[PDB]
Structures are given as structure tokens and as C-alpha cells.
Design brief:
The structure is a monomer. This protein is of the alpha+beta class. The protein folds into 6 domains: 1-165 and 176-225, DNA Polymerase, Chain A, domain 1 (2-Layer Sandwich); 229-439, Nucleotidyltransferase, domain 5; 485-498 and 594-759, no CATH class; 501-586 and 769-874, no CATH class; 876-957 and 1069-1108, no CATH class; 963-1064, Ribonuclease H-like motif (3-Layer(aba) Sandwich), CATH 3.40.1820.20. Helix content is 38%, strand content 21%. The protein has 31 helices and 41 strands. The strands form 11 sheets. It has a 7-stranded mixed sheet, sandwiched between helices. It has a 5-stranded antiparallel sheet with strand order 3-2-1-8-9. Strand 1 (45-57) and strand 2 (63-71) form a beta hairpin. Helix 14 (531-542) packs across helix 23. The longest helix has 30 residues, at 410-439. It is globular and about 90 Å long. The structure holds 2'-deoxyadenosine 5'-triphosphate (DTP) and calcium ion (CA). Residues 583-585, 587, 801 line the site of calcium ion (CA). The structure holds a DNA duplex. This is DNA polymerase epsilon catalytic subunit A. DNA polymerase epsilon is a heterotetramer consisting of POL2, DPB2, DPB3 and DPB4.
Length: 1110
DNA sequence: TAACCGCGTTC
DNA sequence: TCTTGAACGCGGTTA
């Protein structure tokens, strides 16, 4: 019935594709040799596939197909279409009566079925499926996806009927119908365009020849084509102290760039002084000359925009958050001028509210920043991404001064708008475009979806490609039960124990200062007898070389034990430290690949016993955690019996809500607790013989990442080799390092999402057991590593796969082998001595792999890809301490390089989005001062100097700060994940600020989720909770009669005329906050390091006073 | 004071 | 509709 709507949509897409140079190309005819080795002979048209979309065509109801958008070698563009029948399978219980089902479904689905056929597939959840047994299914094929749905609609009813007890009519009777044989439907929830891309092995970014036989990969061409790339950014008028609205506000300026060339278009109706050609080259690598069009009115701006789009024919349009600001604004402003943007440039919102087009992919760079840039949310704004990635500080302009600068400073506005463009285009070209289009060559998705989809969904696709190419039947998406019980107690949450985190030592540790070490002798003993096989291991495994080919093996073997000797008899020494960090590379991946860990490889003793019941078993343990009400099962009945009369004028999911609520109070009433958390150590069997398509997929992507990681390591040294005198060489080498580090980091979230996918909702390969084993194993490796560095040094902090430590300046350090050829083989004893212990204790000797598929012969061997990598030595490492006795602070510290630059700053308020600007600016000013001072006491003093400097300001009640600089240093800018309406009954500074932002300015302030709550804490009302004294810092720039009235009720002081900022601030609250930061970063850690409180203006807590005088 | 929540980091 | 995980810090309220 809705077909016509789908047929109509496709049609219009063709007209637009034609309007942008995409004519549907049908290739010539040919009857001869198909083999790809004859590509030049076969007739057709080669092209670089840039984009693909599902569609509906008629013979010349629609028949499903996929449009394929190409850029040919001769500088042209063309479209081509493959047709593929949508299809899903039917499973059966008794595989003897498959034909009865086949006949039944043929007559039942006569309305929608086109064809049908028995097929066989591998099923990894079947007994003796490894010995060669296949799964029989019925392949339902259809003309289009619409009819495939109608089937699922006509089959799901049966599926529910076979799951409900059959209502017999005769009680006394003592054959089975064909409907009762349908077990399930399978591979039914696969996107059609994805289905075609997998089944025909077509990928975006690959070179193909389009022939009558089909598509052929011209693997001779490896380099991408160069599509026309445009990035654009808009500028809007905006109510003072409010947000832009497409209903009233106008576009004033639109900057954009097209393949290196820069353009600006201005609305003279708002921009007064006409703008002319100028140049913004932020850095030499980022050229950007700009020509300007000064259109008269706003519709001439939109018209000039659409006209130019059609001119250059762009296959890629890049923005920064254009999906939810730029595009929807241009759409409404075109609508309010009676302009159909679909009719004009073929863009429209899809079912997610994002703006896509057929001929052109919309590359919202923000999507990449959120997912792949590996940047914190406090840096995912255009300015920070421009600084972190492009490397230049962009032009900034206060949004409240963009509307008036149309009159006042129109030049300053034009530079800021082209600033947004330059940063957007060169961000896309240098970073996004290579990563996205190259990822498209292995992921069966077009660029639009490769950029936006969740990383878990990406892993799914990759895995779907393997499972299909190995004829493995896809498991359906996982579903969680609505309730779940344990020991009679209802479960709230069950999970597993994640990574092992440890804060051990706090305070300052510096290269120029000195530290005490208590060396375990018996650990030096353990290291000296582990010495021989480790040194062979370092060259044989870590460097993959022969012992008898390296020269100075014995030369090193003694120099290390010499220091091991001088450190053995002198097991108590006070020297300088060496600050090092050790990290296992791709830990959870390498833990999975090493152990053949994958969801299907996990079995009970029930099933693998039914196979070859023996190295099928790598018995591995994981730690289960459940959170459950203390109510026993009998208590549950009472609540179930009681809760039956809630409302009158209920779905199961709705009915669960009330059961939970009443169960909290009943559980809290008698056991004096609401949640019980129990650790149940568990065990799982992972068969070493299962089809390893999952774990191999993880290994492919891991190796995919190692290339870029190894290439960054390679170009690091190239910089070291080039003398400081040659700039260009160094500069280019720096440019290479930045490129390769981004590439390896962008692959990281996908590689780790392979371990995350096993817990994702709707996952096809769900295993809590697998995830737990991965996590636990790793905690055991890092704790085993800690136990050793404890014995030979002082480890400072530890997190999952990482260890921060200081080592005696004389512990064995680094050593360079000399190969007989004339090569230098690197050796770092500290890292390599750890690696051995892992290989001797965490190596899979049951790793079986299929050698002979015909005779089903497996060959056990030994696998271990778990390697520590070492970074260092560092000059300083500042770790904080808790305010509570004994407690420490994890996931938070600062490190400094040999040359003093900030190595790593982790976890602190400075990096996070929001938080109090005081602390951020304080933290950004102090950490660099722990590098000052000539001893731990002189160090903590230079810190205290700038500590008192910041303290002075607070006690000075802001007298030293200009009002403008004052608020920009006292404001807290927390964000709201949702709209206000959804935090009902909760209390926070963000909720109050939002609630007060609304009355002060309007309900249209809190309409959208993601509100920036910029607030300041007031003194009045006195002795009232802090969530109630949150003042919007916007009121302090509002009208004086608006200001007063609100500030009076917010303070509950109806007779207050003093509106000056400094009288309202509760400096006491700010002093406490700044006080805790001083305690945690300076004074307390000093006390645990034996220094006296170096900032005596901030006291110690009671317990820590009582412990200096023990 | 311990339990608990939202945000946003570190893995 | 989509949709990687757990561990942790911190200000702040809740029992
Ligand atoms: N975003 C994430 N999602 C899921 N698991 C993650 C994520 N980040 C880290 N992990 C887990 C899996 C990692 O192997 C483990 C150690 O973190 P980390 O060392 O940063 O990554 P890694 O060891 O995979 O990569 P690298 O080679 O860069 O060290 O923590
Ligand atoms: Ca790691």
C-alpha cells in the first residue's frame, strides 16, 4: 500500500542524481571469459565507488536494489545499480519434515513470497557442527524489502502460537501439524544495503569496473580518487543572552571552502560594510584565500548557496555539528521563504533528524570528534579540536557580540566566520576523510554511516562479513529478561569485575630529587636465575632474531647482573629515581586472541562433552557480581500478591515498575538494606576448537592497528635522528607523527569495542562469561607485575594494564645489542624482565587450529601476544592524595617530560568539561610548579607561593580582579544530559540554574537537551542548601530592573539594592572548594611525604592533625 | 555518616 | 529507533 511512496522517493532521487551528474549507467553486453584476470577486455566503465544507497526500481511493486555512485577515471561521475533479492531464513526443529514446512509456507506466504529453497549453513550452536554437520534452513526470497516485512508480520504470529500452550477441545484423546515445525526466523533484521554489500563483496573506496556480469575490483588501482570536497559553516543572528531560532533569526554570513579554495557570502541586509577578498592562512599547511559574494537579502544568500552547490557538484559536504544546527537552520529559513531545499540541492532529514543526500555524503566532523578523536568532552569544541589536531589557535568571538558586530565590526566578523570554515575543511581533509573512506573499504557501509554508527555496530558489521564468508548462520540479536533472580532474591544488576585499579603512593617524585628503596634480595635472586632465558627471549621473541647472530650477548649478560649485584648487597639505598610507565599493548584484544576467547568458544561441560569429550578445555575463571534486594523469594510473593490494584481510568514492563518500587521499601524495612552485592567466583570452559571467526576478526583489526602504532614509533626516531638544525625535515617528521598517532587512536575504540560488543544490547554474539574472563585474567597479569615491582621498587599507581613507578637510578635500564649485520637491537631490561614472567605464567599451550579440513585434523601449539610496552623515563610525576585517612586518589595525576613539558595530565577538573573555573585555572597554573625548588621542601614551597597567590584573591573577595575577569574565573559550567522536565524531583546546581534560566529568559531556554548551566553560588539565603543558591551568571548582564527582582527572590531578601557581583558570591563556599584542591594536590601529599603543611592558610583535617603527633 | 545519583573522566 | 564494557572522583542529596 505504501509502495508508491517508496517508488516516488527513488524517482526524485534519480532526477537529483541526474541534476548532479549521476546518470544510471547500464553496461554493454558480453558472452565470454568472466575471470577478473581479463578485466581490460570485458566491456564496461571503471570507477571509484564513493557512495551507495538502497532503492527501488521497476522493470526498466518495485524490485529492491542498491544505487552505487562512482567517480570515473576521466574526471566524470556516474551511478550504477545492482539488484539483489531480499531474503531471510526459516529454522526447523525436526529436519526430516522440512518439505512439509516448505509446502506450508509456500501456500501461506503465497501473498508475499517470490521464491524459496533449502539451503545449508554452519551453526556454531549445534552438536558435532565441527565434525562437518550443517544446519538446514528455508531461504525465503522476496521481490522487495516491503514484502519481506509482510512475511515477518505473517510468520511472527505462528512463532507466538508455537510458544503458547495449545488449547485442546477434547480432554480424553491420548501426528503434528506443519505450523508447529517453525523453529524461528533468522537473518531477518539485516539492513538491505548492508546485505547487498556483504553478499556481493562491494565496498566504498574501492575501484570497480561495472560490467553486465557485475562488479570487478580493479586491484591494479590502489590510490583513492579525489572527490569534490566542500565544508561550510553558517553565522546567525541571535537574541541577546539567548539561543538562535530559525523562526525569527536570520543567516548573516555563510563561510565555506571547496578543495583548498575559500569563499564567503554575506547578507548586506544585516552586514553593513561590504566585505572583500582577503586571506586567512592560519599555518602554511592550511592555505585559505577567500573570495566574497555580498548578496543583498537573506534569500539571495540561500539562493547563492544552492546555486554554487549545483555548480561544483560535490560528493562530500563537511560541517561541524551541521546535523543539528547548520542544516536545520538553513532548512527552515528556506522553508519560510517558500524554498524546498530537497528541490534545490537534494538534502533532507532522514528518520533520525540528520541531513543526508543521495549524491553527497554529509561528513559532520563532530561525529568523528565524539567517536574517534580520543579527545575529552572538555575539548570536543571546534576551538580545542582546531588546537589539538590542526595545531593553531583559531579566531574567537563572543556569541553575544556576533549580532552587533554586523554593524560595528563587520571585518572582525568575516574573519571569525572564515575561521570556522578553514578549521572545518582542513580538519576533514587531514583527519576525517582518509580515516572514514579507508574504513569504508572493509566495512559494508557507505561513508555517511561509517562515520556516525556506534563502534559496537561497526564491530558487528565486520563480524557479519566473516560469519557470512564462512557460511556461518547469524545468531539473532540478544534480549535480556525483564526480571532475573538469584538465591530467591530479585536481581537489580549483574555484571563482572572489571580492571584492577590501585593508588599506592601520593605526592611528588622528581628525577633531580632522591628516594629510598628497600630492595627484596630474594626478588633479585628470582631475577638473576630468570636472567638467562629472558635475555635470549629479548632477542628471540621481542626482536624475533637469533641468539647466535647477535654479537655482544655475554657482554650485556654481566653488565646487568653487575648492577643486580651492587643492588643485592646494598638492598637499602637512598638515590635518585627513574620514573617509568609500563602498559600492555591492546591488552583485552591480546588477551582474547591469546586464549581463543570468543562468545561461541564458551561452553558448559554439557555440550563440549557431547563432542570430543582433550584440549577442548582451557578452563578459565571470571568473577560474577550481582546487585539484588535482600528479600527472599517468599517476600517477593507478598509484594506480588499485594500489588494488584494500582490505578483505574497495564503492560508487563509497566507492571514491573510498581513491583520494584514497593520492593525497595519492603526490603529496606526488615533487613535495613536495599542492595546486596556478592562476588561469586565462577569458571567457564573455552573450547580451543570452535570456528574462530570472531577471535580472528579481532586479530585482524588488532594487526590493522599495530601498523599505525608501529609507524608512529618509526617516525619518532626519524625525528630523533634529524639534527635540530634542519627544520623542514623535523617539521614534516612531526606532521607524520601526528598523522599516525591519530590513526592508531581512531582504530582503538573499535578494537576495544570488540571486547565490549559481547555485552552490548542487541548483540548477536553475547557472552558475559567471555567478558569476565578477559577482565579477570588481565587483573591477574597486572597484579603479578605489581608484586614484582613492589619487591624491586615503589609502584605509584596502577590501572587495568598500566603501572606508574619509580625505580632506583641504578636498576638495569636500557641496553643496545649489536647485530652481526650492523644493526642495533633495543633492550629495556625492566620491560623485558616483566614480559618473560607473563610468558612463563600466562601462555596458551592449548591453542588448536585446523590444519586439515577434509580429515578434520587440529594441531595444538603455544600462543601469547601479551606484551608490556615501556615509556619513560620522566622528570616528574605529581600524584594527589585523598582527604580521608588511608584513602588515595586513582585515575588522576600529572607527569612531566625530561624537557619539562607536560607529559600527561589525567582525570583532573582542568581536563573535564564543566567544573569550577577557579580550580581549572588553579590546576593549570600549579602542576607546572612542582618542577621548581631545589629539594622536596623547596619544591612544595614554590607551589605554596602560587597557592597563596590564588588564596589571596578569595580572601580579598575579588578586589584584585576586574568584574569581567572575575566571573570568567568564578563560574561553574555544568551540562544537562537531558531537558529539565526529566530530572523531576532531583536537586542540583544545574537543575536550579536551568530552572532559573527559564523564568529569567523563557521556557524556550530549556527546550533542548544539553543545556550549559553557567552559574555562581550566592550567600543568601543564609543556612540553606547549595542547590538553592545557584545564580545564572547571565542575570548579571541583564537589565537592572530584571536583575534586581530576580536577585531578590533568589536571595529571599526583598529589600536588597546592592547588585554588585562581589556582594552576592559566597566566597566561603569557593574558599572551601579551592581549599580541598590545595589539600589534595599540595598540603596533604606533603604530609604523607614528611613535609610540614606548606600552605598553613589551609589546615589539615582532624585525623591528619592527630597523626603528625601520632 | 553510609548509600546513592549525575557527570565525565581512565582504563 | 538505535545501542562497546567496568572502575573511579567529586560535589551533592538521601536515609
Ligand atoms: N573505550 C573502551 N571500551 C572498552 N574497553 C576499553 C576501553 N578503553 C580501554 N578499554 C579496556 C580494554 C583495553 O585493552 C584496556 C587497557 O586500556 P588501554 O591500555 O588504554 O588500551 P589498550 O591496551 O587496548 O591499547 P594500547 O595499545 O593503546 O595500550 O582497557
Ligand atoms: Ca594498553
Amino acid at each position: 500500500a505504501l509502495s508508491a511512496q517508496q517508488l516516488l522517493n527513488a524517482s526524485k532521487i534519480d532526477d537529483i542524481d541526474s541534476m548532479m551528474g549521476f546518470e544510471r549507467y547500464v553496461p554493454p553486453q558480453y558472452n565470454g571469459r568472466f575471470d577478473a584476470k581479463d578485466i581490460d577486455q570485458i566491456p564496461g566503465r571503471v570507477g571509484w565507488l564513493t557512495n551507495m544507497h538502497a532503492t527501488l526500481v521497476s522493470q526498466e511493486q518495485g524490485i529492491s536494489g542498491v544505487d552505487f555512485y562512482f567517480l570515473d577515471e576521466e574526471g566524470g561521475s556516474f551511478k550504477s545499480t545492482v539488484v539483489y533479492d531480499p531474503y531471510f531464513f526459516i529454522a526447523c526443529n525436526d529436519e526430516s519434515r522440512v518439505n512439509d514446512v516448505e509446502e506450508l509456507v509456500k501456500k501461506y506466504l503465497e501473498s508475499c513470497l517470490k521464491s524459496l529453497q533449502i539451503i545449508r549453513k554452519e551453526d556454531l550452536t549445534m552438536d558435532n557442527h565441527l565434525l562437518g554437520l550443517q544446519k538446514t534452513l528455508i531461504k525465503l526470497s522476496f521481490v522487495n524489502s516491503n514484502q519481506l516485512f509482510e512475511a515477518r508480520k505473517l510468520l511472527r504470529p505462528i512463532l507466538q502460537d508455537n510458544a503458547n500452550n495449545n488449547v485442546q477441545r477434547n480432554i480424553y484423546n491420548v501426528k503434528v501439524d506443519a505450523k508447529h515445525l517453525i523453529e524461528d526466523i533468522r537473518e531477518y533484521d539485516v539492513p538491505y544495503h548492508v546485505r547487498v554489500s556483504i553478499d556481493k563483496d562491494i565496498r566504498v573506496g574501492k575501484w570497480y569496473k561495472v560490467t553486465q556480469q557485475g562488479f570487478i575490483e580493479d586491484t591494479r588501482k590502489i590510490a583513492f580518487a579525489d572527490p569534490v570536497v566542500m565544508a561550510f559553516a553558517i553565522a546567525t543572528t541571535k537574541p541577546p543572552l539567548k539561543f538562535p531560532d530559525s523562526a525569527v533569526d536570520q543567516i548573516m554570513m555563510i563561510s565555506y571552502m571547496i578543495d583548498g579554495e575559500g569563499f564567503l557570502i554575506t547578507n548586506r541586509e544585516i552586514i553593513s560594510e561590504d566585505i572583500e577578498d582577503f586571506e586567512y592562512t592560519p599555518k602554511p599547511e592550511y592555505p585559505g584565500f577567500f573570495t566574497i559574494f555580498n548578496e543583498n537579502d537573506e534569500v539571495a544568500l540561500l539562493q547563492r548557496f544552492f546555486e554554487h552547490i549545483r555548480d561544483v557538484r560535490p560528493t562530500v559536504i563537511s560541517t561541524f555539528n551541521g546535523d543539528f544546527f547548520d542544516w536545520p537552520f538553513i532548512h527552515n529559513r528556506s522553508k519560510i521563504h517558500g524554498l524546498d531545499m530537497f528541490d534545490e540541492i537534494g538534502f533532507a532529514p532522514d528518520a533520525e533528524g540528520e541531513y543526508k543526500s543521495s549524491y553527497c555524503s554529509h561528513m559532520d566532523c563532530f561525529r568523528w570528534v565524539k567517536r574517534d578523536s580520543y579527545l575529552p568532552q572538555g575539548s570536543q569544541g571546534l576551538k580545542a579540536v582546531t588546537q589539538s589536531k590542526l595545531g593553531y589557535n583559531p579566531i574567537e568571538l563572543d556569541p553575544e557580540l556576533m549580532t552587533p558586530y554586523a554593524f560595528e565590526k563587520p571585518q572582525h566578523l568575516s574573519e571569525y566566520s572564515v575561521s570556522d570554515a578553514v578549521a572545518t575543511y582542513y580538519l576533514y581533509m587531514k583527519y576525517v576523510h582518509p580515516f572514514i573512506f579507508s574504513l569504508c573499504t572493509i566495512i559494508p557501509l557507505n561513508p555517511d554511516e561509517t562515520l556516525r554508527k556506534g563502534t559496537g555496530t561497526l564491530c558487528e558489521m565486520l563480524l557479519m562479513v566473516q560469519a557470512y564468508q564462512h557460511n556461518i548462520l547469524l545468531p539473532n540479536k540478544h534480549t535480556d529478561p525483564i526480571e532475573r533472580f538469584y538465591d530467591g532474591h530479585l536481581l537489580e544488576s549483574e555484571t563482572y569485575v572489571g580492571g584492577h585499579v590501585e593508588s599506592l603512593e601520593a605526592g611528588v617524585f622528581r628525577s633531580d630529587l632522591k628516594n629510598e628503596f628497600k630492595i627484596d634480595p630474594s626478588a633479585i635472586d628470582e631475577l638473576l636465575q630468570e636472567l638467562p632465558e629472558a635475555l635470549k627471549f629479548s632477542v628471540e621473541v621481542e626482536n624475533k632474531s637469533s641468539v647466535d647472530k647477535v654479537t655482544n650477548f655475554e657482554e650485556i649478560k654481566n653488565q646487568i647482573t653487575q648492577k643486580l649485584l651492587e643492588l643485592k648487597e646494598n638492598n637499602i639505598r637512598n638515590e635518585l629515581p627513574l620514573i617509568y610507565h609500563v602498559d600492555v599493548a591492546s591488552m583485552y584484544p591480546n588477551i582474547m586472541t591469546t586464549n581463543r576467547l570468543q562468545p561461541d568458544s564458551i561452553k558448559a561441560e554439557r555440550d563440549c562433552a557431547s563432542c570430543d569429550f582433550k584440549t577442548c578445555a582451557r578452563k578459565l575463571k571470571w568473577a560474577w557480581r550481582g546487585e539484588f534486594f535482600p528479600s527472599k523469594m517468599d517476600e517477593y510473593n507478598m509484594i506480588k500478591r499485594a500489588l494488584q490494584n494500582e490505578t483505574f481510568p497495564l503492560s508487563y514492563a509497566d507492571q514491573v515498575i510498581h513491583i520494584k518500587k514497593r520492593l525497595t521499601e519492603y526490603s529496606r524495612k526488615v533487613y535495613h538494606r536495599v542492595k546486596v552485592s556478592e562476588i561469586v567466583e565462577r569458571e567457564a570452559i573455552v573450547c580451543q576448537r570452535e570456528n574462530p571467526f570472531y577471535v580472528d576478526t579481532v586479530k585482524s583489526f588488532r594487526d590493522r592497528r599495530y601498523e599505525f602504532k608501529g609507524l608512529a614509533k618509526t617516525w619518532k626516531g626519524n625525528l630523533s635522528k634529524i639534527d635540530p638544525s634542519d627544520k623542514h625535515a623535523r617539521d614534516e617528521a612531526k606532521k607524520m607523527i601526528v598523522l599516525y598517532d591519530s590513526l592508531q587512536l581512531a582504530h582503538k575504540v573499535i578494537l576495544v569495542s570488540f571486547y565490549g560488543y559481547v555485552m552490548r544490547k542487541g548483540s548477536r554474539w553475547y557472552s558475559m562469561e567471555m567478558a569476565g574472563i578477559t577482565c579477570l585474567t588481565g587483573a591477574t597479569i597486572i597484579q603479578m607485575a605489581r608484586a614484582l615491582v613492589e619487591r624491586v621498587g615503589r609502584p605509584l599507581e596502577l590501572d587495568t594494564d598500566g603501572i606508574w613507578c619509580i625505580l632506583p637510578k641504578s636498576f638495569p635500564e636500557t641496553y643496545f645489542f649489536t647485530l652481526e649485520n650492523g644493526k642495533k637491537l633495543y633492550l629495556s631490561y625492566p620491560c623485558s624482565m616483566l614480559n618473560y614472567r607473563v610468558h612463563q605464567k600466562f601462555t596458551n599451550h592449548q591453542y588448536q587450529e585446523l590444519k586439515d579440513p577434509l580429515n578434520y585434523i587440529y594441531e595444538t601449539h603455544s600462543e601469547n601476544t601479551i606484551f608490556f610496552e615501556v615509556d619513560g623515563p620522566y622528570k616528574a610525576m605529581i600524584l594527589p592524595s585523598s582527604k580521608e585517612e588511608g584513602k588515595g586518589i586513582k585515575k588522576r595525576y600529572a607527569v612531566f617530560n625530561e624537557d619539562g613539558s607536560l607529559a600527561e595530565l589525567k582525570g583532573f577538573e582542568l581536563k573535564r568539561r564543566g567544573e569550577l573555573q577557579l580550580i581549572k585555572n588553579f590546576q593549570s597554573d600549579i602542576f607546572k610548579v612542582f618542577l621548581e625548588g631545589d629539594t622536596l621542601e623547596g619544591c612544595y614551597s614554590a607551589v605554596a607561593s602560587v597557592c597563596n597567590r590564588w588564596l589571596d584573591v578569595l580572601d580579598s573577595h575579588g578586589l584584585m580582579l576586574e568584574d569581567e575577569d572575575l566571573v570568567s574565573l568564578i563560574c561553574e559550567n555544568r551540562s544537562m544530559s537531558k531537558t529539565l522536565k526529566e530530572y523531576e524531583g532531583q536537586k542540583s546546581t544545574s537543575i536550579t540554574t536551568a530552572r532559573r534560566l527559564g523564568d529569567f529568559l523563557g521556557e524556550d531556554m530549556v527546550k533542548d537537551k544539553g543545556l550549559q548551566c553557567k552559574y555562581i553560588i550566592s550567600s543568601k539565603p543564609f543556612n540553606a542548601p547549595v542547590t538553592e543558591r545557584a545564580i545564572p551568571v547571565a542575570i548579571f548582564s541583564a537589565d537592572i530592573p530584571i536583575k534586581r527582582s530576580f536577585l531578590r527572590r533568589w536571595t529571599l531578601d526583598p529589600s536588597l539594592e546592592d547588585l554588585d557581583i562581589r556582594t552576592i558570591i559566597d566566597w566561603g563556599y569557593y574558599r572551601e572548594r579551592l581549599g580541598s584542591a590545595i589539600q589534595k594536590i599540595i598540603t596533604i601529599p606533603a604530609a604523607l611525604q614528611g613535609v610540614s603543611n606548606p600552605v598553613p592558610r589551609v589546615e589539615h583535617p582532624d585525623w591528619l592533625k592527630r597523626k603528625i603527633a601520632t
